[PDB]
Amino acid sequence: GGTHIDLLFHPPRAHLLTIKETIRKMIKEARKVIALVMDIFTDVDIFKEIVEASTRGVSVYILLDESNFNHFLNMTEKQGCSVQRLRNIRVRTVKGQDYFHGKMEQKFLLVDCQKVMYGSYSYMWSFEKAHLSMVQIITGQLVESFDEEFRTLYARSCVPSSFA
Amino acid sequence: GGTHIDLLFHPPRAHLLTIKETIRKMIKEARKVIALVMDIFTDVDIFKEIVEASTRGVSVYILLDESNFNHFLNMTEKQGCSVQRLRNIRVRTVKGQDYFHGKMEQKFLLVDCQKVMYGSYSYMWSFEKAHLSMVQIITGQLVESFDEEFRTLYARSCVPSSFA
Numbered sequence: 001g002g003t004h005i006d007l008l009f010h011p012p013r014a015h016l017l018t019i020k021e022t023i024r025k026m027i028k029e030a031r032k033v034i035a036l037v038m039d040i041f042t043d044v045d046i047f048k049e050i051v052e053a054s055t056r057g058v059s060v061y062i063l064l065d066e067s068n069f070n071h072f073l074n075m076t077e078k079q080g081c082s083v084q085r086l087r088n089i090r091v092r093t094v095k096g097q098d099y100f101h102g103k104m105e106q107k108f109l110l111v112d113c114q115k116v117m118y119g120s121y122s123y124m125w126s127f128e129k130a131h132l133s134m135v136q137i138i139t140g141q142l143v144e145s146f147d148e149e150f151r152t153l154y155a156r157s158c159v160p161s162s163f164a
Numbered sequence: 165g166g167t168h169i170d171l172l173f174h175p176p177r178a179h180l181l182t183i184k185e186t187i188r189k190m191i192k193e194a195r196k197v198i199a200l201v202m203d204i205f206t207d208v209d210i211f212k213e214i215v216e217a218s219t220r221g222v223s224v225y226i227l228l229d230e231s232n233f234n235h236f237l238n239m240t241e242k243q244g245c246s247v248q249r250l251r252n253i254r255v256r257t258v259k260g261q262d263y264f265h266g267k268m269e270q271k272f273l274l275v276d277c278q279k280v281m282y283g284s285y286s287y288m289w290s291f292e293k294a295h296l297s298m299v300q301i302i303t304g305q306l307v308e309s310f311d312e313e314f315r316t317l318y319a320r321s322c323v324p325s326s327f328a
């Protein structure tokens with residue numbers, strides 16, 4: 001079996017769901033594992049869906065760019081919903097080489113080693129309302145390469161400073 | 165015929181060329197058309213390669229995010245190499261919905277309707293030296309979808325203010 005790819009856009013073009021709806025649906029349908037790599041994560045609806053997946057028992061591994069991590073922390077604080085308390089969620093940070101902060105410029109969502117959303121959509125209010133973006137929904141062989149990249153990234157990630 | 169995808173990383177993992185080398189090689193080998201969509205374009209080596217392609221006769225269409233366009237203009241000025249003077253290069257800008265500037269969060273390189281580099285690598289010094297990133301090299305059927313998205317984006321692009 002090979003690889004299948006569909007494209008989604010924001011604003012939508014020739015597909016019924018928005019990218020955000022698609023992200024929420026993928027997370028709702030997760031059975032076992034969610035692996036998320038994200039540059040900036042402030043979107044509350046998407047966060048809620050991930051918390052809720054973790055309460056059904058899904059293992060959630062999140063890797064965030066270190067330089068923007070505080071924005072996710074502020075968002076969890078405001079929602080009164082500390083990620084440290086949630087037993088099925090792990091959050092670690094990734095950084096690039098400094099000079100000026102080097103960043104992890106990577107994002108993707110990998111659900112049940114089965115389906116990947118890969119593209120330019122960051123999990124922020126502004127990608128729902130303001131920005132033009134595109135993603136791929138990937139299934140098949142190429143998903144195993146995203147799995148391997150996730151593990152590679154995870155190996156180079158750090159416990160965030162705040163956590164103890 | 166279907167679609168073929170290879171992944172490249174920065175830093176490199178199990179491939180001989182860096183992403184920047186790959187970008188320069190794709191542009192050097194262009195025979196007819198380069199279509200580029202880019203959020204920020206300040207890298208001088210990559211610019212030089214595109215200018216040089218255009219002097220061999222390759223048609224170059226570039227679409228840049230409007231809010232960062234000034235960074236590309238500054239770079240061309242500094243290189244004493246005005247894009248308005250170069251007859252085989254067209255540059256237009258794209259923006260999102262404002263509230264706060266909505267942005268075109270899209271980037272990709274499409275050469276000869278034949279090969280696409282699609283991923284998180286922006287054409288800046290910092291992606292060569294500092295940031296972690298990944299791209300896909302795509303050939304086959306899916307390339308026709310990037311072609312169609314390029315034309316769609318081009319249709320919604322504006323002549324930059326500076327140009328007259």
Ligand SMILES: Cn1cccc(O)c1=O
Pocket residue numbers: 105106107108118119120121269270271282283284285
């Ligand atoms: C991950 N990714 C993929 C394509 C384009 C992007 O700007 C990006 O961040």
